[PDB]
Design a protein around this ligand. Sequence first.
Ligand code: HEA
Ligand code: HEA
Ligand SMILES: [Cu+2]
Ligand SMILES: [Mg+2]
Ligand code: NA
Ligand SMILES: [Zn+2]
Lengths: 514, 76, 227, 47, 44, 260, 93, 79, 57
Amino acid sequence: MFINRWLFSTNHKDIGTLYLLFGAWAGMVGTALSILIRAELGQPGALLGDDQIYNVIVTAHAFVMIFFMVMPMMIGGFGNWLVPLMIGAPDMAFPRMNNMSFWLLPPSFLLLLASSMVEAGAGTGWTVYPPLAGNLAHAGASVDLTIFSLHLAGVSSILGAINFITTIINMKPPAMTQYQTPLFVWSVLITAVLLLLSLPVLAAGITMLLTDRNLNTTFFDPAGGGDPILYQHLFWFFGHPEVYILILPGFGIISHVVTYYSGKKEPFGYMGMVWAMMSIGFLGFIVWAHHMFTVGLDVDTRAYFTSATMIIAIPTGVKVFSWLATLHGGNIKWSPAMLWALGFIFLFTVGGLTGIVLSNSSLDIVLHDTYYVVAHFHYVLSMGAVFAIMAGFVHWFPLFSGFTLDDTWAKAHFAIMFVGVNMTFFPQHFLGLSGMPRRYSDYPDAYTTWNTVSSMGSFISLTAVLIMIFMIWEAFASKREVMSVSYASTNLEWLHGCPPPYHTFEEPTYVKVK
Amino acid sequence: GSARMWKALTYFVALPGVGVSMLNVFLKSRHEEHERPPFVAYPHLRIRTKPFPWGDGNHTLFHNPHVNPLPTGYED
Amino acid sequence: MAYPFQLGLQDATSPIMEELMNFHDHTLMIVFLISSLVLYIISLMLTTKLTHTSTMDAQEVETIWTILPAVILIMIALPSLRILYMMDEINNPVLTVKTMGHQWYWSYEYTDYEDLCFDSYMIPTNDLKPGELRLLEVDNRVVLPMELPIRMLISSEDVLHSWAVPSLGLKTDAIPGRLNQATVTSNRPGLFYGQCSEICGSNHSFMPIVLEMVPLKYFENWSASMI
Amino acid sequence: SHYEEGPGKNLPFSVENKWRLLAMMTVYFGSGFAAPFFIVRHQLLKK
Amino acid sequence: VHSKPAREQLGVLDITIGLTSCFVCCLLPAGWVLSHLESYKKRE
Amino acid sequence: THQTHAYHMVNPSPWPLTGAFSALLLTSGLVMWFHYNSITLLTLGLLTNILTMYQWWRDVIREGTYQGHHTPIVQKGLRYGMILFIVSEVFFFAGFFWAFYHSSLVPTHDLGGCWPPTGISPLNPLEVPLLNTSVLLASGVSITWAHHSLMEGKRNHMNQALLITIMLGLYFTILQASEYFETSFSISDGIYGSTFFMATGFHGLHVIIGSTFLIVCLLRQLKFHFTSKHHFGFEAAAWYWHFVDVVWLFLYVSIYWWGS
Amino acid sequence: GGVPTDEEQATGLEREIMIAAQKGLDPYNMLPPKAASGTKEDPNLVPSISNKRIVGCICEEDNCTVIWFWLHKGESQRCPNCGTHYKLVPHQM
Amino acid sequence: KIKNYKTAPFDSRFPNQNQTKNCWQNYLDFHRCEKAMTAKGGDVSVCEWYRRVYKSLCPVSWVSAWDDRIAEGTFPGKI
Amino acid sequence: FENKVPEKQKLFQEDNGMPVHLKGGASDALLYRATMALTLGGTAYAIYLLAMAAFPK
Ligand code: HEA
Ligand code: HEA
Ligand SMILES: [Cu+2]
Ligand SMILES: [Mg+2]
Ligand code: NA
Ligand SMILES: [Zn+2]
């Protein structure tokens, strides 16, 4: 029964369950890696010795937190729970490759663990920039294990994207216009499309690098007419679409929780919402070289890339103003999901504006790969996507398990993690403007004070992680049920029981003729 | 009518076209007896940074001793 | 040289840094404008009490909500292109200095006449002579003249590096087989400190940049005194 | 019907014993938080 | 979202055990490794 | 009768699990083959992967033609997903062409500043690649004749078209291997040899995959699985082969003519 | 002769809906329904195999948000924010 | 000419930051200079400017490696 | 070759309780035990080789 239901799962509810479990485990691993990094960066000196092992720690932090936590949490997990219940589908379109992609993920995590085991280590970062990852600087197998973990995660993401696109544009009720679905479906649709168009790009790049090492070829070897700049181009043509992957279901989740707990029967400017989503999806592929302003590109190319980066800045601002407009006029129920959404709005605003300050090109000629960039993507990702994950997590938990959350303790978690991430991530503005680069295991005397403040705030965030896992235990132990759910008339997922049964939508929805 | 037309194109255009291209290559392969180029140890050719995971690590998967010299020379 | 409790940039020495910091506080007053605006809007709807859950009119405010941030972004972007044109200006190369990032150190080459190449290593904490700065000092400094636009041809030997002096205002990636050109100018003599900014092995944190710029006469006095 | 449904019955782990649930969550999240620390100690022993 | 009463309400002691229980085994591993890093460091 | 919606409810299956772990075996065995010279893990991974794929598509066929679970909207989902798969390797090979174009349009000083790099004579593109692209075009016109012979609905031309396509694809693979054996440079021979051999090898592997599609569709037609309107196996084989044909046309034009 | 025709080849759910397509009545909800008239005497007829079925009123033209609610067997219930009538009928299949 | 200068000028043909191609062009046209004037009997010391400009533009390791390529017959360029 | 589809169309619509991946007969059950016995045995052999790479002599 156990091996029939869970190891051989063919229903999206339990598939999202196992997504949530794997995402929680990866969040634990990434939290431990971040705490170890801050243990380096809370007191000057070689607490571990060499910084190669520290680079292994930061590489594992980046890989585990991006590919194994955020995407399996909200893209796989929340999508797999929600979008059949959102569009009235009985199941996903191809649940068998959905299960394949899920069970593809723990081999990727295991290959990354084996990479950490190998004595060479993955001392490269999220960027796997050759010739650092070549046979001379890394004479080992660890970077090959990382590349194969990227292969596993990439083919899982491709399969999930195909399944999500097929489910979205196929098995909505036939009288429904495509411009009538809830916005999380649109967000995960644009997410899956960009996954589909950007994951073969990583496949090409990492096969290029794997062939460069193991098969004596010269794709990025300067001694054979190759160039690492090609890998940088391919990897960032991956990279900025991938960070928009990591932010788009955040847009959907925050829009849904705002329009739920704000009392509005509809979000403000649905057409503007969908237009902004497709606009940042379209422009996410032609701005990939804003990470390339110091490499040595042509200057008119740099001017075009920063101008197009402003063009990607504008419709995100349209999205933010539509969120403020749909917040306007509604009575605010003080559930913790609104607290997460408001934290997302403000912290994502300041993170995106920090991204604009980076996006000015000469400001990257002064400010590339410092801790200013660290502050930017930890504002917009490490608590943008994280706060969106938290909002969806504390919102749909009565739908996921049947047990509610107690508002006082849940808000206590929110307040402590908000304070912890702010204290962690606000000093790196001064750290980057004062001018220390990334991937350092020890820092100078000017940066000592803000590094210590950031590490202390990171320990506050760790205490928040403890209170979260205690809260999951407390919900699962107290087992208080759901008496009723409001706004189920507008939100289709909440009306089929908390939790919904194994076989949902066995009778299709009667969609209006108009 | 479509299926007939495609059958006619396959038999009267595609098959004669493949016959002419095969005859072209077959006649060329009988007249051409290529003068193996002299070995020059160009530093950008025959690069070996790591041995291959097969054989002696120095022969390519589709090695041909007559046309593919090693980093040291031809094998003969 | 960065001082403790620093919130802005290391102060300008180059005119390009002067326009960078002017544009920088332009961007800071812009971001503070937007941040204060969104704070007051958020505080407005969290402090309100009235309700409106009727049909909200959508096609009235997106026009201004599209056009006026477009003005804000274009007035942000115009000085960026201006400074890019300042780096696109022609050069007066009194000297050509080439940096070659080697595995965990640097090598600097002055080759215009009487080719000399020296090695910028890392000084250890226990071997620091009294009074210096930790994690920054180099036994062999990089000597430049002041007030002169000098070419900086930047490459690396076996692994990627990133030559980055934030005080003077230069940061370019040292790439094997691709040397970038950076225009180094200043207005003052003395020591200037920077770092390597790209991951490059087991001593990535241990590659600093020290540049001492003094009057031309002392520069050729140094160059003659070594050889 | 074919699979048992209800609040807490759609999880792969048992929920009824809260102390057993506490033990399994403790060992699960402890392994999750302890994996990178055993990585760093294993590499310190190896180096 | 209204919630039904807890089927297995936790007592003051239960909450105490729960909070500490994990904190204990969710930081114990961390403490062990960090506290002895210097020993571990010994190639011995 | 328990479902009213016309969609498909898959019974629990072990091959997601075993295919994912066989991919784990494949990648791990690649690591052991490159670094620890043990081929056995790679062979076991290949065997498990091919056998898992065999039984997976076996079960897909069994729920397709022996049970009739591919409703019109279900095969609409199938053709949407196949289109998404096609554009997935469109962007995959587009990234490969990006690598080739960044190598060729701006040659570095290590190649002599000219394309192709000096030292090795490039292969003649006028005879054997022209025979290859004629083979691909003949196979494509045979596929579209076969699908029109499905529309007309008659087995003798259907079978003749499928056998001549499989013979053309096998001939193209043999000629590809022959020109690998009959070339003056290796994959370890410069950037141009590296990108040319890697791109052509990926395309040839895709040709082998498409040949497996055409073989299994032929054995499915000989066993009367296909019908007059529900022939999505041959539709998917047709789309994959047309993708293969257009990719070979792009590779032919770009590599064999642009700077040769 | 030639290839088999799916009319006498394919069996199962595909054959059942193929017969449904030839006879012109769709009981398995592959097509949008009809009779968009929801008065008191003429409610919208919703066919269900059970006692209860999810309906969605698109009760305004080009409305981006659908209104989701259940019907139970019995009297014709109205859409909560517009007020058009729906009556649920047993399919008996 | 036999002019006396300080450093290499700003070549307007090559206005970007990449000067690997600049020293590449300098090395190639220095060598075509040397072969052209030793072929037609001109003054071989008229592009000492070209020798000093490639010496200024590209590193000593590259220069010595390329001179070894000349000394063996291994140079990939069109010389 | 003969049209054996309708006779194989009777051996799979039997509501005998076996899932779709096992209705064909004893060959399919043998093959499914075979793909269990080498995937799980391969995975256990894979993690041993990774551990042997992790820990030198
Ligand atoms: C969540 C993931 C995420 C998101 C959304 C973004 C969004 C953006 N990112 Fe970033 N980025 C990363 C993740 C992300 N990024 C990561 C992970 C890296 C580093 C990776 C590595 O180095 O390894 C990175 C790096 C990175 C750099 C590299 C700097 C360097 O190294 O030199 C730059 C610079 O251009 C940049 C820019 C931007 C911009 C301009 C946006 C914009 O999309 C933000 C837009 C959001 C806004 C909120 C706009 C502001 C609009 C308003 C406030 C409305 C009101 C406005 C007016 C009235 C005018 N990002
Ligand atoms: C998802 C992406 C993500 C997240 C959450 C974080 C979170 C954090 N990051 Fe991370 N970081 C990156 C992605 C992320 N980071 C990347 C991509 C880099 C660049 C790597 C490189 O340089 O190559 C980086 C680099 C980076 C550095 C640079 C190292 C160096 O250059 O020397 C530092 C150091 O301060 C740092 C610190 C932190 C801290 C202190 C947190 C804290 O916020 C940790 C607290 C956050 C959480 C704990 C997340 C919430 C999750 C859970 C609570 C568990 C989930 C379970 C359930 C919901 C049930 N990060
Ligand atoms: Cu980007
Ligand atoms: Mg880099
Ligand atoms: Na440290
Ligand atoms: Zn209505």
